[PDB]
Design a protein around this ligand. Sequence first.
Ligand SMILES: Nc1ncnc2c1ncn2[C@@H]1O[C@H](COP(=O)(O)OP(=O)(O)O)[C@@H](O)[C@H]1O
Ligand SMILES: Nc1ncnc2c1ncn2[C@@H]1O[C@H](COP(=O)(O)OP(=O)(O)O)[C@@H](O)[C@H]1O
Ligand SMILES: Nc1ncnc2c1ncn2[C@@H]1O[C@H](COP(=O)(O)OP(=O)(O)O)[C@@H](O)[C@H]1O
Lengths: 474, 721, 39
Amino acid sequence: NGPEIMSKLAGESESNLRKAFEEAEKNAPAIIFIDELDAIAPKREKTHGEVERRIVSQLLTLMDGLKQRAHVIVMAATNRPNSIDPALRRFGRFDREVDIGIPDATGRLEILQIHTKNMKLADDVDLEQVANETHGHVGADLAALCSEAALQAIRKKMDLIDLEDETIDAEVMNSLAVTMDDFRWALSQSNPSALRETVVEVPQVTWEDIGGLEDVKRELQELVQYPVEHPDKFLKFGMTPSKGVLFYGPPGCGKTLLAKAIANECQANFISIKGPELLTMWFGESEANVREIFDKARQAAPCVLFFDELDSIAKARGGNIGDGGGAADRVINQILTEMDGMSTKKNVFIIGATNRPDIIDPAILRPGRLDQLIYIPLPDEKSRVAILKANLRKSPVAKDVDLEFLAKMTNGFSGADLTEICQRACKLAIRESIESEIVPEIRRDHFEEAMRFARRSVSDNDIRKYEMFAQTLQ
Amino acid sequence: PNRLIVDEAINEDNSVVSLSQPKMDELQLFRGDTVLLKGKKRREAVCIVLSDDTCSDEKIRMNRVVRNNLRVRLGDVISIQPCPDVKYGKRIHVLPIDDTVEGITGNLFEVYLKPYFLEAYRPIRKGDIFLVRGGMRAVEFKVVETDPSPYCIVAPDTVIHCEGEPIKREDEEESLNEVGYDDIGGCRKQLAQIKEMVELPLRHPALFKAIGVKPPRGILLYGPPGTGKTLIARAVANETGAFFFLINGPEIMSKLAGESESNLRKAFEEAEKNAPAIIFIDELDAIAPKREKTHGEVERRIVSQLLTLMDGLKQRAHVIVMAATNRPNSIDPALRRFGRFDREVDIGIPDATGRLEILQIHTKNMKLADDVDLEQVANETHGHVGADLAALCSEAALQAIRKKMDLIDLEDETIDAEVMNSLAVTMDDFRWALSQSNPSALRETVVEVPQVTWEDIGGLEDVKRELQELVQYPVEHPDKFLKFGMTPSKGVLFYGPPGCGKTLLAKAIANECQANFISIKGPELLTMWFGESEANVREIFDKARQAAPCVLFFDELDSIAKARGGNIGDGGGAADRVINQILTEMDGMSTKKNVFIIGATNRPDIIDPAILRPGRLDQLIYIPLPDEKSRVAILKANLRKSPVAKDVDLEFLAKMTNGFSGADLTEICQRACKLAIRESIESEIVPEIRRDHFEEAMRFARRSVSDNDIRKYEMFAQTLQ
Amino acid sequence: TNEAQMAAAAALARLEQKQSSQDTIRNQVRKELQAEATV
Ligand SMILES: Nc1ncnc2c1ncn2[C@@H]1O[C@H](COP(=O)(O)OP(=O)(O)O)[C@@H](O)[C@H]1O
Ligand SMILES: Nc1ncnc2c1ncn2[C@@H]1O[C@H](COP(=O)(O)OP(=O)(O)O)[C@@H](O)[C@H]1O
Ligand SMILES: Nc1ncnc2c1ncn2[C@@H]1O[C@H](COP(=O)(O)OP(=O)(O)O)[C@@H](O)[C@H]1O
């Protein structure tokens, strides 16, 4: 490990590193694990000390000596492949890389199950519920979570039995059960160490969650699935698969869900870039981060890289008024460059979305970029019914609720607006249920009362804007 | 049988112990009865038992003086028994301790023991230690001989003796002036959190080494200088009995290469030999600052040496290493990885309540005049930390001393106890020192505990209920939200005329929910924008997370929009550096952190609509000017404790103040009171605020919200439906 | 017994002195009276 080698004086760090390789050969087959590699051989640009430069050279020569040290494999751990001397990653030495990443909800449950094998849990403990709540946690944090929950249960009993001796009675621990209240307390005390890291996972959104848009669902399958499900037909007909599609239309119509749902069915990782992140790069003149996003997309391939609020910068520059410049800017130019250099052989599909297509840099729509365009209109009557039922799929909706009637009335409402009705009716049912204890289902009165506050968010002035653009594209 | 756990006390009286009512009936004693407590080494103490509504059923609340007499520590278990046959004594002989009476001379009985014992009816046992404060000293005494045995109650006719040399302190008896938990004022929530983490493995080492649950090995404390980071570390070690080893940056950094590494390693070896032990590293940023900030080989090596020593704690059982820094991100991030220093406690800055507690602690030995008001000082000392309030008390003491010493002219090697005992520090001495003191944290972020209740807010009855549904129900009734698939809102924005209680609503709901309150003001958002330091937005939300449950109140959301021209604006859009960071933090914050975001603005028409999307401040509450019944309620709330005369017609006043906001009704109430007081003093050159005083106030108060503004706010609210 | 009952009265009196609206209102008026006296 870094600290063990770096804490040594000049002439001791190089000797100890050499001895480690010699011992592994003597005991071959052997594995040498170097943790905190960035502490031993950081990128040369970050260090100028005579000792630090020499130990880098010593590690490089020892790695090259592995041609003679038969059956010795050297593994290293770092936080970022770009934090270390690039020489280490040249042919030979450390020429293989594995991306461990962050466990998703399924992996987190598995970790919780492992670190509780020895723990007696009460019947009210639900580790799957915990795994869904522990967003941003890594295995080190879930292990700490189990420890804190166990210690809470211990404290509560130990202060009551008052048995102080050199050893602990097995029966006392064996009968101690950890309840859900102790896990919930530990969750409030635990603080995730990876909360600000990029989240790359297969989304849980499925096609059953999206009302209407039957033809768009099929179109995405043709664009995303067929190029890899039937590659022999694309070769036969000389077809070049599209690299991505831009969605445009009113807000709150499911543009994000479409990108997630296709990623889910394809079992591909979904990467979400949001407007504020594009604006952060624009304002801070840190557009270089775009290259890391596209590189992560390749690392996580097969994946779908979704750029939301693609117009966020154009609007930040004035949008309807704008300024003296053109559509091109720092961030979009890096995106255009990365897309041009990306091959379809990496199974990375790019999807964009905008609410103002009239101000998108036309370059992004040229062949080789987001050449496909799909219009997502406000839902029609049959779609609004599907949207209400999809949003209420998990709610205890009473049999007296006429969802088709609501769809017939809410003619100007967007999909997001129909959700507010569904959630408002749920809140009213919750209020009624709570009051009864001072109810089993959401009653028609709750939906009709919700309609008193619900309003359409998309006006006719903005609908025409989208219709005129959609007509312009024919 | 009658075995209870020893806990901390609130009552500062050395002869008083508190037990919960159910034990008063199970032990069959009356309130104020005399009981004996059985401690360690066949020792006991006699005290008077009172009842309260805060003691735990199975605990006994006692202070440090009683615990030391029993040779027990917090968390231990003692036996309690009644002794109703205690009688009066006639002779009690008390002598001072040699380690506390030094440099001072005079009649110790007249200064200390007489007011302590005279008509005090204190239970006393031979060998008891007790503390009498006064004269800017803390002087403890031991009881050496009594006629009755082994205990008695001192009577008004008891003769108190004090003849002989000072008593040499026993090596197993800790001084009462040592740092303990009762020396810490504010930041009590952090102290409690730390105690839970460390006291278990330190008091019960046999528990952890026998089970599969590992203890914490390191805790990082951080906050501005002078906030008690070291004070806590010492109090914990002294109360639990763990060996305390002190490290500080300058001591290690001043050493040569080959000496700094060995001295740091030795500190860890010594703690293990004396385990259980606590190693406190102060000024951690001086030993292991972020590596990007250092260029020398020695500094990089000592960081690696600290990292390896921290990792060695897997073998050094029962050793906990605590460190103090100013910022959690000023040090090598490696230290904060799993293990090492993987626990974090934000000490921060005490609020007005904590500052009052600190002033009371550092004045315990001071004689204060009747005009001294420490609560008024605590409210004025914004931006001060505990070290500033301690300096304030010391400076006030020295000013009072100079005034008397230059007049009495008594020059000797020792100081007369009577001279100091009769020296009082007045408001002029605290006011002088306060003007000289300069806050060390003038512009730091302070997390406060709200003191506003619903009874302080007139009107808005429907808003109060709505906010409880938004803030309390998601956690009070989580089974209903899961049943109905409801997603709780992350926040709410208030809009409407100024002076209508928008801020009070946020504080009142935070108070009832027992949540912390964080206030961010417009000028802070403007500072971040202009100075291109929008990264500081993360620090705001990071404190909100660590301080959870809390309510994060963003005032003057439009401060930047107005700085950008407001109604005219510029060539750009609504987005800017600061709002983008705020929106990013909001999107990345989960409802499971129990952090509720509240905003407020007086110009909702120019707020970036992005902040009102689902997932942000999607809920909008309109707070109009109070109506007829609300204005009366506001007047009653502001006058809840005022001596209002029976001739005051609060409904008539409310009918006249049709265009007034709640802020304007308060000025009327305060002015009418001041006018009544003015008349009072004039009569000597009155007991109640008369109708004439409210009518006179009506001639000076004005409405702050004009008719043009009311229509603007009402039309906006109507547009929102 | 009666010696403990006299100790009970002393312990309760100190508790009430430490816990202690009338003195806050009177002290706030006293401060305003002195300011109006000198202004
Ligand atoms: N076609 C649809 N089917 C079901 N729900 C929808 C649909 N369109 C919008 N919604 C609802 O609106 C909300 C916002 O959708 P989203 O795709 O996030 O909008 P945007 O893409 O503009 O961000 C979703 O949570 C969803 O419940
Ligand atoms: N919360 C507090 N309660 C009481 N005293 C405090 C508090 N915070 C600071 N102080 C006082 O201020 C000083 C803090 O000094 P110290 O603990 O050495 O701080 P540092 O670690 O910055 O050197 C001490 O005199 C201490 O009594
Ligand atoms: N509804 C109300 N009830 C009682 N007092 C009020 C009310 N509204 C305003 N006030 C008075 O106005 C003052 C300012 O209130 P505050 O909530 O700080 O206004 P703002 O939110 O505009 O800053 C408070 O000190 C309070 O005494």
